[PDB]
Subunit: 338 residues, 5 copies
């Protein structure tokens, strides 16, 4: 995640121009390797045409260049690229919207589950730890960054997300599917035991707790859905072939022909194809943002800070249900009293 | 479902280029028969023009080719194709979003319905089996893959989804409509009997159970809606005629005319219509992804793994309500305790 | 509703090609009258130009044809047509999504409302009949097919949807507005009387019943909204004038001029304007699908089967609350028991 | 609101053609003044060119006309117009979707609040009158039609929406903000007093009442949001300048030049610029529908019938909570009994 | 926020034309600096070409101008600009839709929390002050205007949003993350204490209070999400480079060449590039509205009035829970009584 929201708070003279001098999460960082390969190929073809070809071969290359520049428009790169990028961005923001946040649940755990003794504190910490454990299990499933921090469930034990008893219980309950759903059943049974033990005073509070927990379950299931059900591979292949074939054609059709031959559109012989390079910038940049956001849980600069979210959720949840349980600031009249 | 999410976690040099070497769920697998038919027709027409026609007939064919290539733009293939594919993809993801998951309901069944004896266990298994039975009935209705696994309700009996008593009850309740809704009424009456029998301690938990069950009912009704209310046949016919007429025109108008005649756009005589083949790739591929996703419950490579979902839901639901009912890992202080 | 979902389950060779041989819900059935009128006008104009005009009049007609074919592009038919059709299709699926289904409510009525005697059975049947009566009142308001089956409320009495007592009560409560909302107040007061009489054991179940009933009220209000608040007439008039003026221009500008005069774009004299007829097919077909879906509650082939939905909802609701109330299949261990 | 839904129930021969003969809510009524101004300016310019200019001035005007007709395409009127109209229509239907309907709340008031005596009747009428009063306060804020019916709160007193006691209470609670939210606090406190007084039997029914009332609060807040947060003035100015500059250019560039001079595109001298007038129709009509729907609460023909909605909501709410409270039709067996 | 909704209530002759004479929130105010820079550069280039260049250099500049005006179309400014502006506007209205309003919660606090003594009043004020404090903490995080009003939490203490005890408690609970979530845990624990102390009569009302508070938590989390997860910097850089490169090209390619040389498109030598300036207006205005709305919480004219919302929410919440608690207008029969 590269944040620049405070820099664009007001519309000033050249507000977006200052953002062109960034490198992390930038278009140049995503684009420079492909651009260098394209530039090398273009100038190799240029040197071959201008030095390594005879006059008849030069005329043949000029005919081929005019043919390619006349039939480049047959490729609907904008059509397929716009569809693909719209799908990518919609799925990207939907993937952020289903990242689980335990704040409502941790408020309800800190409130409803009573007891300032060790048992009630352990109960609250265990409930919010079950929530964070289910979240970190699905994030281990869907994020390569979280999976690199926790290559195994023993890493989750060594990071405080899982107890050895929970690890043994999860090993006992092993099925050939993903086991991220297990802490939700654990939460349901532990909350039922808490209500039966008098730690939850009313079953309506139990319903509220399980409603928030099931909302988290729905969000984690949506994350599992977006990881499992990818954008269809046919679309990715088609848009890849579209961009690649467009600029493989531009390697030939955008060559500067000899201005002595007086071809239309080739009256002026520059060396740098500025408009072709700009078109490469725009189209291959569109493709590279599609490549960067299609899995926003990886290790790109503009990918989600999933490890930070995991750490913050665990720390904030434990603080909210442990230290802030019935620990209120002194209730005093405010400034606007009476 | 063809999953490649882990392969595109980071935006690297040619990240989408490695996906071009796939065959399952690929554009080539969906496209090769149509492309071979089109290529055969194109080269038959080419051989007829270059070998089987006299000079006057060749001139007539050249006039026809120029006419077709000048009036090919009258076909708005991109317009209707973009509309149709946008509708297909929206309905496709809406169809995935209403695939039922019993995880929230199975958590509430494992928690709320009490009793470690045989009666409470049978009650929990029967409730979550009613949920899975309604889901598998609507999936038998909407998916050809599920219908091929279970051609009859006796197959559902032989697969453990239905008891013979439930089969006889469903035969008694026969109406000329789809009977997928029956296990929801069964769930409601069984949950009411469980609450009246003391197995459910409070009616608020009964409300939670029936809320989750009715959410599953809404999802299954949406699946029934998408199976019944298809994309209107007029749109499918129009987009089919658009693509087919476009490339039937391209069979004539994209022929390489004799370069001795010096027609504009026909100065260079290639043999392979590379740009026409690319246009076929893009447009007919758009059409074939529309054909593949319009019913995502069939047996295509990128269709939903409905049988796997059915098996996983049944197994996970039975494990959650049976073996995990009040079976908790030992509650111990975590690493960050005190 | 024309259903073809099972025919397009898999992406096969020419999957959409087999759908071109349909007549019900087809593009040809929606298009043939307009196409015949257009073809007759085109060939009348052609015969007038080629037989009924002198040489100076033929030259004037050629100038007019070239002028019309040069300025046909000033009409943005694709722009307004795409906007209108997107609006039509969005409203069409929103209108289907708010068609009421009483299945969740009938499950809650079959469960919550107790009593296997005649009074409780009559109570359950009356409640679910109030739900179906409100649904059929709003569907009589919004659907011409339902209004043709039930031209009056006495037809609803003769069809079992309304009792004569309910008919007299609705006549007493007459106001100059639509009275579809009355059975919701009837349901609320009858459910309150049922809870006060002990037929509903807890008020939380009463809340669940009224929540489902009010969800049905929201759906029926959305149907009333879509019937009352039409797409603005200005948009319909503009898109109609766009299509009509486009092809009234094409009646002149797409005429095949004399190829002896050697006009550009008129070198080859066909008789059938194949591309103009294809453009008519696509654009006037887009217009005709917009005409067919703008009111999906009429009597078109692809319109909603509202009478079937009404009959199925009534029959299934009465069966669910009457014969299936506390009528459960025998609870026995499943195949995967222990 | 101009309703024509019943006229377009079926797709017939020229279904949309009959709608071209309407005047209320029509494109001609919205367009004729601008079209007459444009036609007068066009023919004044035509008469100046053909009568008031010398040959050199005529040649200069011809150069200017060709320049304007060659550079008219630099204006992206379709781009900005499509964006603006899409935003307008989305906000228009969102504004209709948040028009409050008290039907669910009036059903819950008629059911839950008990007492056929004068006190319970007054309580029910006061609660549903608080709902209608909050709705009419926000509609007075957002609609010029409602504000013209009720220029002051004393008009609301004289129309039965407000009592003099409520008027004095609202005058006492005066703050420099809009006071539409006050009847929601009144409803909450009155419903709490009703539950404490035994008129509401259970607090779960109180929760249902306040949930429906808060749903109405959310809808009224959305209406306040759409009235306050307008479409940004920059967009309106840009689309206005786009349409106006396009047709100010068309005043010169679409003039019929002298056909003796044999300019391309000016070979035929008509008098009526039919395609320019059609383009004016489409583009300025798009602009005028955007002008008509941007505030759908005004006094246009296709604007919402807000006063009718207000009157219907008040009358239907008072009838539902007053005359229909525990006033049920006699419960008798239906036609399909046994 | 610049409001003009009342001025566009009806579609009149030139309704949007009167809005062109505004300055606050106008396109000219957002555009004039860039337009002056562009005009200065254009006329500097014009004077260099017409005065500072020799005939061969003038011919070279003419070739460069024709080359740039022929290859300007290679830049897809409309494509990327439409995508970016659609994303900006969608995120802008989503950011407004998640601005928290405490009105439902303040109604529930005024109703449910009982006691006209000092303790109950202090309790209600403290609860709604916790709601407003969490809202103002997240608005301090996301808005530069709110942050300028309250540079520190001591400013929130001096503005009555925070007590010194709450300030010390927040200092004690310091973590390296944003602490806007703390008043939600405070609200949960205080509401639990209120229910345990008898100030809240039933736990169902406690559930309603915590549901509204958690809805506010979800809205504030969405605001935190939109502040943190910016539109990807790659998109902003690409659209900035697109607009800037388009008009840097237009600095050369849109120059008026010598009409004596008789270049096509340069037959008439104006001085003011009216269509280029209009294109600058439209495209750079699209970019500037994107710059203005990307952070709608800054200090632009059309940005949200966040400080006004904060002040109004605090004042209205304190009035609703303090002065309006069980302070009802006298309940009297209305005009339509009997
Ligand atoms: Ca990534
Ligand atoms: Ca398929
Ligand atoms: Ca219809
Ligand atoms: Ca209006
Ligand atoms: Ca701003
Ligand atoms: Cl879920
Ligand atoms: Cl449903
Ligand atoms: Cl409603
Ligand atoms: Cl609100
Ligand atoms: Cl949240």
């Amino acid at each position: 995640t590269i944040t620049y929201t405070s820099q664009v708070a007001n519309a000033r003279l050249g507000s977006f121009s200052r953002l062109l001098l960034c490198w992390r999460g930038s278009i140049y960082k995503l684009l420079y390797g492909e651009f260098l390969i394209f530039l090398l190929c273009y100038y190799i073809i240029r040197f071959i045409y201008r030095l390594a070809l005879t006059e008849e071969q030069q005329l043949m290359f000029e005919k081929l260049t005019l043919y390619c520049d006349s039939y480049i428009q047959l490729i609907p790169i904008s059509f397929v690229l716009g569809f693909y990028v719209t799908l990518v961005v919609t799925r990207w923001w939907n993937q952020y919207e289903n990242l689980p946040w335990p704040d409502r649940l941790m408020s309800l755990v800190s409130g409803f589950v009573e007891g300032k003794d060790e048992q009630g504190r352990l109960l609250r910490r265990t409930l919010i730890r079950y929530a964070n454990l289910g979240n970190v299990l699905i994030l281990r499933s869907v994020s390569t960054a979280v999976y690199k921090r926790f290559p195994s469930a023993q890493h989750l034990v060594q990071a405080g997300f899982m107890t050895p008893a929970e690890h043994k219980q999860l090993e006992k309950l092993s099925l050939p599917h993903n086991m991220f759903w297990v802490p939700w059943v654990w939460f349901a049974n532990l909350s039922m035991k808490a209500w039966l033990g008098g730690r939850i005073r009313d079953p309506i509070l139990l319903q509220s707790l399980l409603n928030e927990m099931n909302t988290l379950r729905t969000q984690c299931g949506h994350l599992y859905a977006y990881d499992w059900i990818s954008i269809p591979l046919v679309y990715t292949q088609v848009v890849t072939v579209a961009v690649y074939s467009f600029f493989l054609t531009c390697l030939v059709g955008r060559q500067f022909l000899n201005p002595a031959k007086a071809y239309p559109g080739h009256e002026l012989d520059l060396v740098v194809p500025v408009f072709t390079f700009l078109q490469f910038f725009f189209y291959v940049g569109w493709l590279k943002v599609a490549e960067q956001l299609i899995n926003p849980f990886g290790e790109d600069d503009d990918d989600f800070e999933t490890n930070w979210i995991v750490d913050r959720n665990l720390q904030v949840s434990l603080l909210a249900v442990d230290e802030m349980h019935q620990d209120l600031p002194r209730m005093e009249p405010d400034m606007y009293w009476n």
